[PDB]
Design an enzyme around this catalytic site. Sequence first.
Site, PDB file in Angstrom:
ATOM      1  N   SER A  51       0.805  -1.227   0.000  1.00 44.95           N
ATOM      2  CA  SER A  51       0.000   0.000   0.000  1.00 44.95           C
ATOM      3  C   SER A  51       0.841   1.281   0.000  1.00 44.95           C
ATOM      4  O   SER A  51       0.259   2.379  -0.036  1.00 44.95           O
ATOM      5  CB  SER A  51      -0.943   0.010   1.206  1.00 44.95           C
ATOM      6  OG  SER A  51      -2.096  -0.784   0.990  1.00 44.95           O
TER       7      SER A  51
ATOM      8  N   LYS B 194      -0.059   3.551  -2.748  1.00 44.76           N
ATOM      9  CA  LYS B 194      -1.217   4.439  -2.735  1.00 44.76           C
ATOM     10  C   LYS B 194      -0.788   5.913  -2.851  1.00 44.76           C
ATOM     11  O   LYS B 194      -1.551   6.742  -3.361  1.00 44.76           O
ATOM     12  CB  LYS B 194      -2.058   4.170  -1.489  1.00 44.76           C
ATOM     13  CG  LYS B 194      -2.927   2.933  -1.657  1.00 44.76           C
ATOM     14  CD  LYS B 194      -3.430   2.370  -0.349  1.00 44.76           C
ATOM     15  CE  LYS B 194      -4.206   1.106  -0.638  1.00 44.76           C
ATOM     16  NZ  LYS B 194      -4.294   0.152   0.485  1.00 44.76           N
TER      17      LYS B 194
ATOM     18  N   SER C 167      -5.878   3.508   4.329  1.00 40.54           N
ATOM     19  CA  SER C 167      -5.393   2.419   3.487  1.00 40.54           C
ATOM     20  C   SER C 167      -6.555   1.619   2.912  1.00 40.54           C
ATOM     21  O   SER C 167      -6.516   0.398   2.829  1.00 40.54           O
ATOM     22  CB  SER C 167      -4.418   1.530   4.252  1.00 40.54           C
ATOM     23  OG  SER C 167      -3.463   0.995   3.365  1.00 40.54           O
TER      24      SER C 167
ATOM     25  N   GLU D 214      -5.879  -3.525  -6.538  1.00 39.10           N
ATOM     26  CA  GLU D 214      -6.098  -4.143  -5.246  1.00 39.10           C
ATOM     27  C   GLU D 214      -7.068  -5.318  -5.389  1.00 39.10           C
ATOM     28  O   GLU D 214      -8.076  -5.205  -6.094  1.00 39.10           O
ATOM     29  CB  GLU D 214      -6.690  -3.127  -4.265  1.00 39.10           C
ATOM     30  CG  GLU D 214      -5.771  -1.952  -3.919  1.00 39.10           C
ATOM     31  CD  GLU D 214      -4.529  -2.340  -3.106  1.00 39.10           C
ATOM     32  OE1 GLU D 214      -3.694  -1.444  -2.836  1.00 39.10           O
ATOM     33  OE2 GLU D 214      -4.377  -3.533  -2.746  1.00 39.10           O
TER      34      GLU D 214
ATOM     35  N   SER E 162       1.448  -3.468   3.784  1.00 42.76           N
ATOM     36  CA  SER E 162       1.663  -4.813   4.279  1.00 42.76           C
ATOM     37  C   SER E 162       1.131  -5.776   3.216  1.00 42.76           C
ATOM     38  O   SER E 162       0.277  -5.420   2.406  1.00 42.76           O
ATOM     39  CB  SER E 162       0.966  -5.034   5.646  1.00 42.76           C
ATOM     40  OG  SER E 162      -0.446  -5.115   5.563  1.00 42.76           O
TER      41      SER E 162
HETATM   42  O1  LIG Z   1      -4.839  -6.468   0.666  1.00 41.09           O
HETATM   43  C1  LIG Z   1      -4.071  -6.954   1.425  1.00 41.09           C
HETATM   44  N1  LIG Z   1      -3.529  -6.241   2.548  1.00 41.09           N
HETATM   45  C2  LIG Z   1      -3.881  -4.879   2.899  1.00 41.09           C
HETATM   46  C3  LIG Z   1      -5.124  -4.335   2.567  1.00 41.09           C
HETATM   47  C4  LIG Z   1      -5.379  -3.002   2.943  1.00 41.09           C
HETATM   48  C5  LIG Z   1      -4.421  -2.238   3.640  1.00 41.09           C
HETATM   49  C6  LIG Z   1      -3.191  -2.807   3.976  1.00 41.09           C
HETATM   50  C7  LIG Z   1      -2.231  -2.076   4.659  1.00 41.09           C
HETATM   51  N2  LIG Z   1      -2.182  -0.745   4.789  1.00 41.09           N
HETATM   52  N3  LIG Z   1      -1.087  -0.428   5.544  1.00 41.09           N
HETATM   53  N4  LIG Z   1      -0.472  -1.582   5.896  1.00 41.09           N
HETATM   54  N5  LIG Z   1      -1.214  -2.595   5.335  1.00 41.09           N
HETATM   55  C8  LIG Z   1      -2.930  -4.125   3.592  1.00 41.09           C
HETATM   56  C9  LIG Z   1      -3.566  -8.377   1.238  1.00 41.09           C
HETATM   57  C10 LIG Z   1      -2.949  -9.084   2.282  1.00 41.09           C
HETATM   58  C11 LIG Z   1      -2.487 -10.380   2.054  1.00 41.09           C
HETATM   59  N6  LIG Z   1      -1.889 -11.054   3.030  1.00 41.09           N
HETATM   60  C12 LIG Z   1      -1.705 -12.373   3.084  1.00 41.09           C
HETATM   61  C13 LIG Z   1      -1.023 -12.632   4.274  1.00 41.09           C
HETATM   62  C14 LIG Z   1      -0.807 -11.426   4.901  1.00 41.09           C
HETATM   63  N7  LIG Z   1      -1.333 -10.467   4.139  1.00 41.09           N
HETATM   64  C15 LIG Z   1      -2.635 -10.942   0.792  1.00 41.09           C
HETATM   65  C16 LIG Z   1      -3.267 -10.202  -0.224  1.00 41.09           C
HETATM   66  C17 LIG Z   1      -3.421 -10.776  -1.618  1.00 41.09           C
HETATM   67  F1  LIG Z   1      -3.402 -12.129  -1.520  1.00 41.09           F
HETATM   68  F2  LIG Z   1      -4.511 -10.351  -2.315  1.00 41.09           F
HETATM   69  F3  LIG Z   1      -2.315 -10.314  -2.267  1.00 41.09           F
HETATM   70  C18 LIG Z   1      -3.730  -8.925  -0.014  1.00 41.09           C
END
Ligand SMILES: O=C(Nc1cccc(-c2nnn[nH]2)c1)c1cc(-n2cccn2)cc(C(F)(F)F)c1
Length: 262
Positions: free
Chosen positions: A44, A47, A104, A140, A211
Site C-alpha cells: 500500500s 497508494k 489504506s 487491489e 503490508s
Molecule cells: O490487501 C491486502 N492487505 C492490505 C489491505 C489493505 C491495507 C493494507 C495495509 N495498509 N497499511 N499496511 N497494510 C494491507 C492483502 C494481504 C495479504 N496477506 C496475506 C497474508 C498477509 N497479508 C494478501 C493479499 C493478496 F493475496 F490479495 F495479495 C492482499
Amino acid sequence: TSAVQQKLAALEKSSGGRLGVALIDTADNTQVLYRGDERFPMCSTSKVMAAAAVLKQSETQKQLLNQPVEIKPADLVNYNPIAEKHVNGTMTLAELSAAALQYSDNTAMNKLIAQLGGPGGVTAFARAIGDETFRLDRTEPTLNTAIPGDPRDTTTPRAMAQTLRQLTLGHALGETQRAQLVTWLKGNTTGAASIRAGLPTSWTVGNKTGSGDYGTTNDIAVIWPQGRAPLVLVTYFTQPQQNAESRRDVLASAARIIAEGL
Ligand SMILES: O=C(Nc1cccc(-c2nnn[nH]2)c1)c1cc(-n2cccn2)cc(C(F)(F)F)c1
C-alpha cells in the site's frame, strides 16, 4: 565498518528477513542506504503514487477532487473501511484519496487507479516525474502478493525516497497539490507502530504504510524534526516464509537507528 549501515545489518540479521532502507537528509543532501537498489513489494505504499497522480490531474481539472464517484457493491474488495460506509452512494475523489492514504482503503485505491486509466496510469505518473523504477501492474488486492522475485508492483528504497521527496518537498506537484498531499500524509492513522514508533516524539511525521504476503511490512515517511531540515525515510521489509507475521517493530527500529545517526 560503516556507521548506521552496521546496526541496520544487525537488525536485519536479528529479524530473519530482508530489510531495505533509504534516508534522504535534506540538510547535507546526504543519503543512507541499506539494500537501497534492491526491489521490494510496495504494497500500500503505492497508494501515495496513485493519489499524487490524481492530484497532478487536478491541476488542470480544478473541480476534479470534488467530483462525485459512485461506490457500487461490486467495487468492494478485501479491505474497505471507508468505502463500505458509502456503498450504493458516492464519494468524491478527495474523499477517496484521503480514504486510500489515511485508512489504506483498497476500494478507494482502485477508484484512483480507475481514474488514471489502470495501473499503467500510475506508472505513467512516476515516469513523468523521473521515477524509472516504480512499476504498478495490478489493482487491489492482488498487488500485495509480495512474491519473492516477482518484479510486479515493486520499487527500490532509493527510488521511492527520491520520489517521496519530490512529491512532498520538491515541485513534482503544484504547491496547492503538494500541500494537500502533505496534509493527507500527516493525518494518516495507520503505522503508529511503524516508522513513527522509532522517532523522537517531538518530530512531525507524514507517512504511508503497507503490508502483504510474506510478512511484508512497509512504511514511507517525510519527517520534520523541530529546528532542522526535514528528512525522507523509506523502510521496506519482507520475509522468507509465506505465512510470516508482520514486523512493524523492524520499521520502528530501523527508524530509531537512522535517527541516532543524526
Ligand atoms: O490487501 C491486502 N492487505 C492490505 C489491505 C489493505 C491495507 C493494507 C495495509 N495498509 N497499511 N499496511 N497494510 C494491507 C492483502 C494481504 C495479504 N496477506 C496475506 C497474508 C498477509 N497479508 C494478501 C493479499 C493478496 F493475496 F490479495 F495479495 C492482499
